[PDB]
Amino acid sequence: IFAEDV
């Protein structure tokens, strides 16, 4: 899993 909020 890769996840981000940017």
Place this chain on the structure above:
Amino acid sequence: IFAEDV
């Protein structure tokens, strides 16, 4: 931005 690889 929200992004994911799952």
Place this chain on the structure above:
Amino acid sequence: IFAEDV
């Protein structure tokens, strides 16, 4: 708003 169940 981003919401999920996976």
Place this chain on the structure above:
Amino acid sequence: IFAEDV
């Protein structure tokens, strides 16, 4: 998996 971004 639960996820939420707000």
Place this chain on the structure above:
Amino acid sequence: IFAEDV
């Protein structure tokens, strides 16, 4: 079961 109220 998913419920989302906005």
Place this chain on the structure above:
Amino acid sequence: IFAEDV
């Protein structure tokens, strides 16, 4: 905002 996942 309400999210419920069951």
